[PDB]
Amino acid sequence: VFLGLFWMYNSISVVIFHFFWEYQSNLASIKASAGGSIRALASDFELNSINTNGWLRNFLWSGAAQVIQSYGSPLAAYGLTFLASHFVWALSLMFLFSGRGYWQELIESVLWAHHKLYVVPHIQPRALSITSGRAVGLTHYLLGGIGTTWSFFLARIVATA
Amino acid sequence: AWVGPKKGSQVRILRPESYWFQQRGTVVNVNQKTNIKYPVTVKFDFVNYANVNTNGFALWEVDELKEGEYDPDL
Numbered sequence: 001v002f003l004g005l006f007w008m009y010n011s012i013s014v015v016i017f018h019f020f021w022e023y024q025s026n027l028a029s030i031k032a033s034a035g036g037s038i039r040a041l042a043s044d045f046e047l048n049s050i051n052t053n054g055w056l057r058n059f060l061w062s063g064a065a066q067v068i069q070s071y072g073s074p075l076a077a078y079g080l081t082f083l084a085s086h087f088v089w090a091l092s093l094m095f096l097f098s099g100r101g102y103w104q105e106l107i108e109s110v111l112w113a114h115h116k117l118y119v120v121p122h123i124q125p126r127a128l129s130i131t132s133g134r135a136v137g138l139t140h141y142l143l144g145g146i147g148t149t150w151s152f153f154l155a156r157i158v159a160t161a
Numbered sequence: 162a163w164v165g166p167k168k169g170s171q172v173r174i175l176r177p178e179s180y181w182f183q184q185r186g187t188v189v190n191v192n193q194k195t196n197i198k199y200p201v202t203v204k205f206d207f208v209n210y211a212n213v214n215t216n217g218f219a220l221w222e223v224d225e226l227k228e229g230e231y232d233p234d235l
């Protein structure tokens with residue numbers, strides 16, 4: 001289930017990316033004017049969502065202007081949540097890539113430092129268990145990715161619509 | 162005659178690899194048989210990573226401490 005949650009995140013992220021790019025493409029196309037009736041392709045999605053580079057340029061990098069240029073505007077909160085989501089997502093990487101034993105030994109050294117000063121907590125400091133570490137990493141990964149998409153989508157669709 | 166730490170007396174662990182090394186524990190019982198290599202059974206307030214706080218130690222791996230010659234604050 002832990003791995004299936006990552007793959008659900010991937011699946012739903014691609015699904016919402018497809019929907020958002022199609023929605024923006026349709027909004028731009030219906031903004032032809034009235035006279036413009038040959039949309040050819042145009043349809044930025046239909047013309048560019050065929051490459052990974054097409055996505056990376058015309059959807060992510062293109063629409064990120066709204067969320068990264070939101071400082072000093074009411075969408076500055078979306079910008080800050082964008083940054084915080086990236087931070088939480090890299091912290092997830094921290095939890096997912098690492099293992100319990102190392103952190104246990106680090107906590108052993110820190111606890112020696114505590115005992116040296118007569119601090120000695122009795123609820124013995126133990127690092128997160130293997131499953132607990134995986135769960136924390138997955139929670140942070142989902143939070144960071146979903147929050148990044150949340151901030152990006154909301155800033156892009158509120159500033160431009 | 163009795164050999165080893167007295168029952169219920171605090172001892173300091175001299176086993177370098179023990180989870181309670183140089184810490185303090187209470188002696189539960191000492192096996193009065195010469196063939197037992199680790200007779201001194203010591204109980205600790207702290208549990209190790211295996212969630213067990215009782216272990217047997219050799220006679221030379223425990224230092225019996227007097228009633229007031231150790232540090233009560235660990």
Ligand code: CLA
Pocket residue numbers: 080081083084085086087088089090093
């Ligand atoms: C000390 C370790 C450390 C730190 C601090 C950072 C810092 C950062 N990494 Mg990072 N990283 C590190 C080690 C570290 N790296 C290592 C070893 C690796 C492995 C190679 C990585 C791999 C990595 C990746 C892969 C990514 C990052 C990213 C980031 C950035 C996250 C965006 C940001 O600033 O959000 C913080 C900014 C804010 C504005 C948040 C503040 C406002 C929020 C809403 C509030 C949070 C405050 C908090 C709640 C305290 C308030 C308390 C109150 C509630 C009481 C940031 C520059 C991301 C990035 O920059 O993408 C381009 C990213 O994707 N890192």
Ligand code: CLA
Pocket residue numbers: 084087088091128135136139140143
């Ligand atoms: C930007 C920084 C940031 C953010 C946003 C989070 C966010 C989170 N961390 Mg976290 N963490 C961070 C940095 C951060 N962490 C750092 C630096 C470390 C150390 C490396 C950790 C270590 C860590 C561990 C070890 C664990 C978390 C967990 C969690 C989750 C807690 C779930 C919850 O609310 O339970 C409560 C659930 C509710 C439904 C309560 C309702 C929601 C509340 C009301 C939201 C508002 C919170 C609060 C009111 C904000 C104000 C607090 C105070 C100032 C009043 C949450 C997703 C835990 C969980 O991971 O995932 C399994 C967990 O075990 N974190």
Ligand code: CLA
Pocket residue numbers: 007008011012015
């Ligand atoms: C096994 C579990 C399971 C099942 C049964 C479904 C079922 C469904 N999901 Mg779904 N989903 C699941 C798990 C599952 N999901 C999980 C875990 C996730 C998270 C990633 C999702 C995420 C998800 C999303 C995001 C969406 C769906 C959608 C759908 C619907 C797709 C309808 C469709 O495209 O028709 C196509 C299929 C047919 C028309 C059936 C016929 C196809 C061919 C012709 C059959 C060939 C038969 C052949 C003769 C015999 C073959 C035998 C051979 C195998 C030996 C359908 C109800 C979509 C939906 O409901 O949209 C409205 C949608 O948007 N799912």
Ligand code: CLA
Pocket residue numbers: 010013014017052055056059060061063064065068085086089144145146147148149150152
């Ligand atoms: C240091 C570099 C760095 C790093 C590490 C990150 C890290 C992240 N960014 Mg990010 N970003 C950066 C720089 C960086 N950013 C810069 C400089 C910009 C421009 C301002 C952006 C703009 C940006 C946007 C606009 C978005 C992110 C998102 C994300 C998150 C993706 C998490 C994940 O697993 O996605 C999993 C990876 C994917 C789902 C792939 C999507 C990307 C490709 C191009 C889509 C291709 C679709 C196509 C149909 C092929 C599908 C294949 C399928 C099998 C996956 C993560 C927090 C996204 C997010 O929230 O999560 C997705 C998001 O919406 N970032």
Ligand SMILES: CC1=C(C/C=C(\C)CCC[C@H](C)CCC[C@H](C)CCCC(C)C)C(=O)c2ccccc2C1=O
Pocket residue numbers: 094095096098099100103126127128129130132133134
């Ligand atoms: C860091 C790490 C630990 C150490 C984590 C510990 C010891 C959890 C304790 C962290 C404390 C509780 C953080 C408290 C919350 C932070 C202060 C941030 C939230 C509040 C701020 C936003 C203000 C593990 O135990 C572990 C286990 C398995 C795989 C990977 C890892 C892993 O990566």
